[model samples]
Target: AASRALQQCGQLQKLIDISIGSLRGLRTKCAVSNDLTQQEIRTLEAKLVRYICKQRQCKLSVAPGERTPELNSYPRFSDWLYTFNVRPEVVQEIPRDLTLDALLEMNEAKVKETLRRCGASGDECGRLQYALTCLRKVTAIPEEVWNIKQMIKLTQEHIEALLDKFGGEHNPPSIYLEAYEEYTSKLDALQQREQQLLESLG
Candidate 1:
């Protein structure tokens, strides 16, 4: 009876040792990614060496099983992207066909607006620029643009272009027409608005 009890105590001690060892190993694993102590590094090296040896010998050693996405899994990513896709400002406003093209139009409109009001004071332009940028995602329109110091620096080239006639006459009307054409072209490409909506409703 005493011998049997001793054997049971030994088994319990072994189990305790295993539990403690596993906890230590877990702590080591967490540190390996963040900060590796010398002992943890050695433990990792020994495991790597054993793995390599098994590979070289064509012996299959069980490593951590890599989980591949199951076949016929529900499209998790499509849901995530769809969430952003259905989002309003991604399409400027609510989208028609949930396509990225509308978002592109909204972005182009935003940039044009930013450049058009390029002559404002630094604070004003910066505020407006932020508002236009926010319009691509956020609902509220800022009262004015924030014109940062860098904007003055950034748009100075555009300012210079306006000043220099170079070999050709600087025609504001023609430039405005071209800008207008680009914006209208964007509108046409977007086609996000339901075509014939008014007529259909009527």
Candidate 2:
């Protein structure tokens, strides 16, 4: 029983370390992008609260639509120094003893692969380059189109409300046409890019 408990404790310590490391990864990505959404912030905070609750066996309270409070009541673990150091604003700060050589190596490999496929050498970079470029471009579609999508959804809801007010669609008002034109104009570029990109790839 003692040996089993010691092994379990060691595993718990590893989970805490990895959870903190994952959060640090998220922060670094967000910091580099400098576009942390409110939803993303909430998600990270929720993960932290859940992790603390599980690993520390303490039921920490986090109100909905708010950040998690500090776990002041529970006995602090030295292993959790990194975890506790995480703050919303300074989430990207490096730990005193942290090293990211492995991360850097992975990134270096990806860049090299991209460059090679992008025709860094002789003639004809190959169709694989087109395929890779197409994939990369597709990944960017969400960030580029999310705002437009939300606006279009709002427009749809408003149109439905207007229809309800009018009590029928027997020759709708000029407002309908105006709204349609506005939204279709917004949709044109996004649709065009998506179609072109997908069509370009195999």
Candidate 3:
């Protein structure tokens, strides 16, 4: 099946390389915006993968996920896209702020751009549109819309939190937590979103 092509076929090597390289270039371009840390940008990249997975309806076939120690985190999505015949530019967005709203907007914009280029129609176009809109809304950080500075602060805090949670033997919680505490105000913005989600569902 088309879905299984990425996992089973070794024919996707070129496709993976192109897509990953394109994404790496996109990442390099993203460095232009000081609003996001390296790690936070990585999270955005991972989110892009999740979007691709949803669009293609491909489950995590090659491995568990980007976060786990089992994989490099960024390359799996690259491979997945390559198999789907998706070009890198299809998902590449102009790198900007790392705010929740900004990230979603960028993805949605890129998805629309891709749809236009591919001339996708029927379920394919609708699928991409739905994925773009849904993820944009799902990932939007309502409190910090268009606020790049706050977004940077939030990204840093998120980085610290990731280190605390997944820093492994390198950075312990005791030390990491203290280091991360400085950004609590920024982190709170993200926390607010979580709280809002819970409140909505409850």
Candidate 4:
């Protein structure tokens, strides 16, 4: 199936020379300012998977979701605040002074008033208010896809670390191998789910 091909079947042996080092070599991207949670992201991800698979006339066969520990606290405070970019300094300042719920709901006049309170100048206020257009964009499906992408990457790193631990041992323990398999399965499913979203969106 087209959807089956999207799954990450290649395993530890396929991993090339390692190290995705720093220096801003990372995703320059999720949208939405609130509602942070891995489970929520997966729900949207699964929805996208179904939509795309239906489009391609295939189905995504995978394990169902399991319990995810306390995850509303998953996305950093930066995720929400950073969603509303202003002068870098004022970004933290306004949120510190005002909750995101209040900050996001502000009208042009209220935005200007809030910006002034947070030390924004006249031009700064105009630009900050204009950014709400992007707000509408980000708070939609893009953020959901980005969140799924992020989970896929983290799962990759996790499996890589596991392979590093067990890759060379001839008689690696079954539990460790099972753990590696579980992570790979997760990585594959997420990649497939994300893959559908990208193709569907494009």
Candidate 5:
């Protein structure tokens, strides 16, 4: 029932999409990269962050999805992720084969331990743990939506830094190629979801 926030979300998302397309249009104009092109690319990405990401304080903290804390007791880890819309995105660093029984059976310390075995560093450990918290205590629809949008915002920012790091290497890793395409798709998906928010929330 906040008309202002809904419209703000719509306007901000649409404006953000325009700048994103502007960057893509710049790409095909030249197949070869010069120092000039790299700077131009930097300029737009910085602008996206400076304008849309930072100004609105909307580097993501919104929600529109559902969650069921009570329902976490029985599902398989993979299925639970699917049910919560957390997989293929949030918890990819962790294994897909675990169960809620496995996660909740232990304290947070042990869950982090389990995640560490699956490849969790300290930062990643907390991230996966947040999802686990959402599972056990979350029943709020908006909270998870905010969780997801916040995740995407981080992706929107980090994937570029990731590519830049990859660019420094003589040979690119498989995941950067994978990450770049994944990022491109998320941009489109985010725009639509923003529009969905405008209509859905108001």
Candidate 6:
């Protein structure tokens, strides 16, 4: 069944690379924007049809989906396109204060330095490094969106809280509460500033 999907298509490897990369790009776009486009769907569908035809070892004589006015009516093509189009678990917004490279590299270096100072075992260090690596993909800090001076102050408080919570052993509840406090404090400050601006305008 799989073998009959295409024939005489020498562009297998090229199509494979193109198809995978295009699907991945769509995934990234959806992650950042929460939506893909009709044009993207059309382009991906064309490539997928060509690739499927090649795999079937048959000439592209069958325009299998041309008559389907409804996109979902074409089962195979719809399924293939649906596989690439997905919404992300969380949406992300770019920070105006720092470039992505700067933000990631800064935290990466800090994580390494903290692990170094903690004198953790190789296995523990490896775990932490792996966690940080995964976090870099989706991590966005509120500090990156606010003024550096305020961030520096909050960071000091956060450091103190972390040390107090983890100085002997981990206290997950306290750590979370401390994090929540910082987040709310930042949010409150921004709201206050907006309120003051409104009053001044009035």
lDDT of each: 0.36, 0.44, 0.48, 0.50, 0.55, 0.45
Assess the local accuracy of residue 124 in candidate 3 as a C-alpha lDDT between 0 and 100.
50
lDDT of 1 by residue, 1-202 (tens): 3333334434433443454454356554566454335455444434433322222222111222431222112112222122222222332332244322233355655644543443324444343344334433422012112223234344444444544543244555665455445545544433322233323444
Q: Write the per-residue lDDT of candidate 4 for residues 1-202, one digit (tens) a residue.
A: 3224223221111221111111012212233333433334434333332332232221122222321222111222333333233456876575543543354576767767877887876776665465454443433247768999999889999988988888989899987887888899989888888888887777
Task: Give me the runs in candidate 5 sitting further than 4 Å from their true place.
Answer: 1-134, 140-149, 168-170
Candidate scoring better on TM-score of 1 and 3: 3
* TM-score ranking, best first: 4, 5, 2, 3, 6, 1
Please report, as a residue range, the 10-residue window in candidate 4 with the lowest summed lDDT.
15-24
Note each model's CA RMSD in angstroms. Answer: 30.3, 21.1, 19.0, 17.4, 15.3, 23.9
Show model 2 residue runs off by greater than 4 Å. Answer: 31-45, 58-81, 84-202
Please give the lDDT score at residue 173 for candidate 6. 71
Tens-place lDDT digits, model 5, residues 1-202: 2344445555655555676667666665754277657666666655544333222232122332322222222223443333223334446766555665567567988877776665545766665576566445522336545766786787778777876678677777786777788787877787567656655655
Candidate 2, 1-202: lDDT as tens digits: 3333334445555666676666667656566354444345445545544443343332222222322323222213333323433233332332333322221234445534543543343222232233224323422345545555565567667656655676466786785666656656655655566556555542
Point out where model 4 deviates above 4 Å: 1-140
Best-fitting candidate, scored by lDDT: 5
**Per-residue C-alpha lDDT of model 3 across residues 1-202, encoded as one tens digit per residue:** 3335344232334444555665666556667465444555455445555544443333233344442332223234334333333445653532322222232456556655645654544455555455446545433334433354456566776776666675667545564665566456656665566666556545
Candidate 4 has a TM-score of 0.32
User: Of the candidates numbered 3 and 4, which has the greater lDDT value?
Assistant: 4
Write out the backbone clash pairs for model 4: 31-143, 32-138, 32-139
Clashes per prediction? 13, 0, 0, 3, 4, 10
* Candidate 2 overall lDDT versus native: 0.44
TM-score of each: 0.16, 0.26, 0.24, 0.32, 0.31, 0.23
Q: After superposition, how far is residue 56 of candidate 2 from its true place, in Å?
A: 3.9
